[PDB]
Amino acid sequence: NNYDGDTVTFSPTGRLFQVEYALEAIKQGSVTVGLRSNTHAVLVALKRNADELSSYQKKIIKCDEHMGLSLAGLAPDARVLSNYLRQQCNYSSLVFNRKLAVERAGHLLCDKAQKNTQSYGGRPYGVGLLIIGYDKSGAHLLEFQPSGNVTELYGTAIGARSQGAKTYLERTLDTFIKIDGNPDELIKAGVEAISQSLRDESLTVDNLSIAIVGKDTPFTIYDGEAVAKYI
Amino acid sequence: GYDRALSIFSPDGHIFQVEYALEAVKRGTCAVGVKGKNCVVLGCERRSTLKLQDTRITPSKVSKIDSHVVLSFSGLNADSRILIEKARVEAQSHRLTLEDPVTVEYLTRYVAGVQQRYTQSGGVRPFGVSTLIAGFDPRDDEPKLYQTEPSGIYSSWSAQTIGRNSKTVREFLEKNYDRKEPPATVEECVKLTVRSLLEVVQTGAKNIEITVVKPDSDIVALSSEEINQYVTQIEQEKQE
Amino acid sequence: MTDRYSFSLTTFSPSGKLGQIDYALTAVKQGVTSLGIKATNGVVIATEKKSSSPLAMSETLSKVSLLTPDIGAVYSGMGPDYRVLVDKSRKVAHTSYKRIYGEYPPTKLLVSEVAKIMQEATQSGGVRPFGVSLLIAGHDEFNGFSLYQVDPSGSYFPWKATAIGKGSVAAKTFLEKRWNDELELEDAIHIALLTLKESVEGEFNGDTIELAIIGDENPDLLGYTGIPTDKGPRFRKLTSQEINDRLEAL
Amino acid sequence: QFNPYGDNGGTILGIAGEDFAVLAGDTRNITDYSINSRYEPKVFDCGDNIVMSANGFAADGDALVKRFKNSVKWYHFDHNDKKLSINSAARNIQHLLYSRRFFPYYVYNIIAGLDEDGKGAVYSFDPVGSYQREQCRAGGAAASLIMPFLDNQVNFKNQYEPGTNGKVKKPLKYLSVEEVIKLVRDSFTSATERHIQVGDGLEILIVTKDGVRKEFYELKRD
Amino acid sequence: DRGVSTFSPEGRLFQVEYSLEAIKLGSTAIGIATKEGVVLGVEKRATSPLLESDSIEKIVEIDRHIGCAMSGLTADARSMIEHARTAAVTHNLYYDEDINVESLTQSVCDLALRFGELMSRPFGVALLIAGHDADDGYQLFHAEPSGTFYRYNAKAIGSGSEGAQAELLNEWHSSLTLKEAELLVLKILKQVMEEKLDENNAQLSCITKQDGFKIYDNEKTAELIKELKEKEAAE
Amino acid sequence: TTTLAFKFQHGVIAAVDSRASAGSYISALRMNKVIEINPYLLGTMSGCAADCQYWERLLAKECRLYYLRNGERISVSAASKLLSNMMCQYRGMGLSMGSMICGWDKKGPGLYYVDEHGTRLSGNMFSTGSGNTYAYGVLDSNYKWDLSVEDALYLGKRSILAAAHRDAYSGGSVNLYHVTEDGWIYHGNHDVGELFWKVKEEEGSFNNVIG
Amino acid sequence: GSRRYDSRTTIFSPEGRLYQVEYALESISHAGTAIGIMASDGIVLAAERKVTSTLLEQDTSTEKLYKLNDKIAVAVAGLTADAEILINTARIHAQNYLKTYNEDIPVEILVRRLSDIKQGYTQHGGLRPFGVSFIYAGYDDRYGYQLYTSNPSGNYTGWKAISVGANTSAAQTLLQMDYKDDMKVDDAIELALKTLSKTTDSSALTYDRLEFATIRKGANDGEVYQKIFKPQEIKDILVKTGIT
Amino acid sequence: TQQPIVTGTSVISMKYDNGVIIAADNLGSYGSLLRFNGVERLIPVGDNTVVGISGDISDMQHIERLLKDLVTENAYDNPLADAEEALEPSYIFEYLATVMYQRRSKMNPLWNAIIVAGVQSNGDQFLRYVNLLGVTYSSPTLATGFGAHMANPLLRKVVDRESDIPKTTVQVAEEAIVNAMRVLYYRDARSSRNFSLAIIDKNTGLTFKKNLQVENMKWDFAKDIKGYGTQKI
């Protein structure tokens, strides 16, 4: 009300409204799902178009051979943050000859987002990210919020109508975690999960976007007729 | 440093500071530009609220940017000096790095770029000035007349006016200026420029300044008596 | 962090007033009375030592300050603002003059430098004006004795005699009747003590009054002998005893 | 006084075929008269069917290769996984080298691969960035020993057709991969004999449309 | 007052949303992408008859294989064009090749959100970036001041955009020829323009693989207008 | 190296050798010492190969940007000056670059000499490199404004040959260019080994050499 | 943050005026009147000190008239402290020009430089403008005797006669009435004092309430002399012209 | 640019079937003066890596601190710091190599020669060298300074190539290292009798041996040597 003019101002109940408004931009964004087993980790994203003449906005970005994310909210902010991750993944390789741990990647994103919430002049990031990766401790899935909060999860979803997919994963928890050494069945579970967030529209060939990373699988993105198999 | 964003968008999609800068131009004295077949003339109003003025030393309204290009303006006088200085520096800088004098179009594009930069830079306000830039390109006999404004847009004109009561003199020029046959001589071009100012000026005494620019760096400013002869001839034809 | 106040805090109002300067002058009005009188062979500056508590040692708080050996200063208004101005005034007398010309600045030029500092606080970004008016008395070879007033705006005026602060209006009237161009220094000190008694409520003695003069050279206060041209400071602060002696002949 | 440069010896050799290309280099690393390693790889697969070798000062050579490999990575990120052509890689390397025009990478650099028409390509660089496409190039310590041999046995220089007596040249027939590898092995065997910094091992990287293949051969260890 | 980089309660940047309103006031620009090329066309909209209309430059060359049309506060576009041209030629310097249309568009869009308290406000102009490369063929992009860019088969921006976009919805198909696209831009421009369309107050341009980016002559456009009138009178 | 270039009736000729050295060692037999900046602009090279390539390819970047902004081809006078201004920024830093900027513009054919010191000279004829003195000898005695394109091409070709023969650090091959108002025209790569014997027989020159 | 407390000194009104410049001009209108009159053989500068006291040391005082160099002087109207900042800058610019070209600075060039500084405070920096209006009186060998004025907007104009400060409307009318082109310095001196005598808010115009100066070629042969009048000399010229 | 003051001499090392061995004497020389006799130049990093350093001792102590800080920093927000995400020899080496090459590129080098010896997660042996120039190389045997000239020849008789590593036991490798250290004591003027030795095995872990001495030295034949040519008495 009087305490939402900038990010440097607490409300009387201890809330940061500019951060909460940035969180709102994620809810307006298109749905995206993340889930993992012990061997692989999967991202599934519903892409959005402007109209029938337009293309479908890309949702998934690669950060390294072993790491990448999907976005929901302001796409340019995802480009800034994914660029930062690319550089950090790359600094780890060039200096330490070491692939960047997914957990440490989350810690770096948290700290970058936080600086924007405590300083005058700037603004919070207006995007939520789902980071998947495979490192020395196996498969991982992270959820990033622009408040700074990063959370390691078995599965999750963000965007509009994401609560439906999140409930499905909460039921299926015991099943999909056990899908080891079977990438196609893990993607099936992700496609079935994101389907719980659909209304009116359904999954078409240029609508669906899938990504996967695993034990002997580099981070690869599937679009177009490459995802027709899963429709 | 002072970084405050003064020029910003409003809910209806307007930049008020840029629009209020145009109001300062509306307040400024009238300036007019007319291009003939082989020349361009720049007319300028002098408000007669200020007498006891020393006309020898008072800053003239038309300024030479180079030997072949001139610049007149309407709006804040102090603001215009900054644009003129920058333009003059760029003119010598172009000669120094490219070995050709600036084209009128290039010089205009630079001045317009400066005005634009002051509409999306922190800590600064837009120039309260619109300019008429006229001249002839090196080794070219085609006349050039351009206009700029605080927003930074620019364009070429067969004839144009800016400043206070510019709406009236533009009305006059639109019906009197024929594109198929522009003022063939210098006389006809000056006569049409004086006529257009007489719609607005008040007295035709020391209120009208005229500057003729011809090809190959031939620039001259008319005197009071020379202009007064045009004023006399126009009204004597009007009494009929 | 960073000082993000890069804009003026003092601005013109529709009526043409500079509010913060006017308000600074109001703070000066509330301040304790101080005065200055110029004689033929000297200058005197004086003020009341308004002690905040009787437990406080008022000798440690110096309202009258030496700027150069031949220039002194007194104020009315906010004490802390005065203290930092004296520090800057002492330094600028060296950096912008003595280190260049090898001698101390004349009164009018040091005043000019102080005035400049106070003007900048009236225009620079993220600062308020100084809440003091200064009276600067001094002597130099080519201008002789002089007395200047300096206001929060940075404006300064030379005076034969004047007063600033609480009871300045009454005190300036008192000085107009008593001042003439033939006054000796002792006569000016006498008038200063008379003028200052009118604005003081409580105790009036050497311990509650601070008074200094710009007069003859004091070779006893120089600290060394051997150089004929160096004859000592003209600034001298009167002692508690020296004040009381002149209060008996009052 | 501190000398930031050093000489780690070695020699490299690039030959372009009609539909293939080879980049070979010895595996010996040295300082002065000592041997550091008998097997220290010098020719690298940089991705996108490009092979590269920076010969001279090992520290500067490793840094350049490391930077180019990084440049390829960022080329994919920035331009939608587009394949970096050999001509585009060559130009990119020129700018990497000229970055240090006033504190150079003390290396002679060669890259090899296939052009956009599928033909074999070799590009050669100097330490400060001048590059050019070539059919044949030896670089490093024994470059002056090998290059004349390649002018003779690859481009048939000073060779004419018998009976004509200098009137008609030897025609420029193309070479097969098997014929090229023979010339490479004979070049390094000869260089090992007469140059003290060359020896221990020979590693060859062959580039075709099918990918990048390696071949290793022993050399004299004295 | 309030921050320049402030979020609204709905999760949108105030300044970006307000700049979009300025673009709605701008003159109409239309782009249509085909397999034979991409066509770009604009409304010039001269404020007076004395203004020499050929000096109105709302269609601009970025490279030989990339063109650009603009709508909104057109003065803001000059620095964007300058950056685009520099980016296009700089990439040619570093990589000895033409730059991808998408990569060029992305480079322009990176400037968009560089505003705060960098420039003091977002750009007040939208761009239609049309071009061709070997990888993705003929392309048309719409670059906004939000930093977002969408690819389009056909797109209209400016004051008559939603009316023109509905018309482009019905008319566009994947087998359009270049000549058909030219007439289609002229048809829709004539429909949304205030003044009567002619060769002096409207401009056409195209980008083909062979000839590259070309702005059409007033004589060439005049014939296409006459060809349009006759084919509309044909039924 | 040896480079030359000269104006004449039908435009400008530009001829260069192809050798590259690393002390006494001939590092390259076939190097391109000309850069096609644009269809109407050429750039010769002499000195540090890296400097010549980097700065003239950077000049080409700057000449292309001029065309995009002004919608007009850059002049030879302006192009040569941009290059000389670049040299003046790295003045004293140790660059080694001698070049001729050849082209055709509105004023007709243009030829400018530019070097690392920032020197910029307009003229009808120039020759740079270690073997320029040999080339000047042939040029000065045979040059006319009234030359035919066929004779002019031969003169520049023959002038490089003269230098390639005597100068140890010049040779390999000759690259010819002819600049017209329709643009420049490449006139081939000519091996000096073969060209020498051909010229000796046909011209009768080099009598001192046995063949 | 800090934005909350920013007055925004460099913005336009809806009518296209600069708020702070207009308010600074309002400040100057309450300042003591200063008059400049240019004649064929010299220039006069007259100015009124504001409500003085008997205890003010006049002979060592300077609030209105300042010397920029040997050829150029200025009369001040507004905040004295602000004026001294600008005066010292102008004195430096004059010396920089002299060091560079080995010639005394032309009057207009000095005036333009100061006016450009004033302009800068209205367009950028976020600081308040200088609440000062100058009358420049000077001589150079190009244009001869010259009068200029500058105000907080940074706009400057040339004059034959001009006033700044209080009652300029009334003062300008009186000057416009009695001024003629063939006028001489002694006549201009009389006009300046007569104008102040009629426009003053004080009961009577006396020597202690005035600062006065002339720039004359009345120096031995082809050269120019600046005369800042002493209190006794102002008293004499008041009797001579018949005001006291 | 500087000059080394207090210096440490040769560091020698080699691979064997199940791990690596590294050794270095305990001397800190001040030119020809054998100033400091208790200096440890082998510095363990975790339980899987040992860094051996020669050259300037002040720069060695600086590096020692960088490594100590590296371990601290790796443990930050890392639950697997003593397991999967522990520091590896390849990580530690590349860090140092990055530092060494950066310092030489600023013309302010760390005047050292470093050998990183250790065993990786997968049981693979790690042995790589880096120096003040940023020059890196790997070999079955590695040695710095004098060791390069005298020790490598002896150690290469045991492991001449890669295929000889599985055939080499820890007893044979240690014996070879200890003999090499004796030879260096005979022939290096800036060496000492006292030295430290470290073994990093993939089964038995890190064994760090201190206060070792060169023994079984041959000197008796010196009694028979008389004069420099013609002297008999």
Ligand SMILES: *[C@@](C)(CO)[C@](*)(O)[C@H](Cc1ccccc1)NC(=O)[C@H](Cc1c[nH]c2ccccc12)NC(=O)[C@@H](C)NC(=O)CN1CCOCC1
């Ligand atoms: C004569 C050959 C002079 O000796 C020419 O000027 C020639 C000019 C030239 C221009 C462009 C491309 C190639 C050649 N200059 C050189 O060849 C030059 C001579 C040279 C050597 N050190 C120099 C220092 C300062 C000035 C000139 C110098 N040589 C080079 O630049 C050498 C170092 N570069 C190469 O040989 C580069 N090639 C090596 C093999 O791989 C392809 C690149």
Ligand SMILES: [Mg+2]
């Ligand atoms: Mg050998």
